[model samples]
Target: MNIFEMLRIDEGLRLKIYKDTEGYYTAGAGHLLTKSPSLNAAKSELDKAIGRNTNGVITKDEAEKLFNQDVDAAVRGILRNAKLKPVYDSLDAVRRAALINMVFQMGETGVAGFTNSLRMLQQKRWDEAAVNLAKSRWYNQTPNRAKRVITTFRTGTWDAYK
Candidate 1:
């Protein structure tokens, strides 16, 4: 499965503003409203598309569009990171999706904290990389999601997404 399909399940669809687990103002498939020009532009675009002031609400179409933007940005963030870019290149599609999925939840900077994990991934040590990732606070906070990502990393298959 594609990263977007996997993400739609993990992030879920929320057509209204809500607080995420960390209490950040989020909407539309985990789009964290962190005072960015990109989000402001997206909000305005959505408002225009719906032909009304959305305020804190969005349509399903808008939510899907917004989700696409967020996931694309997450992929860009991975490519932008000097350290992550190489590892990203080293991985196959399934493992690449797993890393991007982790970045989708925690941002590139947060994922970068897993120095050992990235190293193992770069070396193609799938089991070791999954073990290192499972040892993180990210795993602790979201065990189910983490388990899926870790399993994908270890197996290099779309079974988790399936």
Candidate 2:
């Protein structure tokens, strides 16, 4: 099954699957939903959810590889849907990576829905693009993740979010 199918299972099973198969803990796993198993197990679960080609386990290096592949796929899909030929025309590798990372985390629909961000990017307004990125409902819901991605866009640094 695809990542959406795997992750969008019944809430109870989703939690259990994440915990048992991936070693991640949902609300029932901890007091503050902050506890989880090792990073390896989490990566394994994430890979499984995202339909990554792996052996049901992921090392840090392997996770990084999968992340890049997923991000690339997301960016391609977004650019195709937007019919924006210049989407990546002017971006350096690092900026492309950052944009791809955001697209992956937010999905193509979410990224394309960002009217202000898209305008800022098209205008080459780096600062405004960063701010526009941080002004979305997604960003408000996940400040830590949003802040990391915004920082990446602002500095043209892919490592910030990764």
Give the winner by lDDT. 1
Instruction: Write candidate 2's Cα lDDT for 1-162 as tens digits.
Output: 222221222121222223432243322111112145564555455555546744344344543444445545776786787533366556666666556555655566767677777677767789989877876776787676577667766776645533
Model 1: per-residue Cα lDDT over 1-162, one tens digit each: 788888888888889766677766677888776544455655665566556899779888888887887788988998999999999999999889988998989888998888999999999998888888888788888899899889999998878778
lDDT of 2: 0.53
Output the lDDT of residue 37, model 2: 59
- Against the reference, the lDDT scores of all candidates come to 0.83, 0.53
What's model 2's TM-score? 0.55
Clashing pairs in 1: none
Candidate 2: segments with Cα more than 4 A from true spot: 1-16, 19-69, 83-85, 158-162
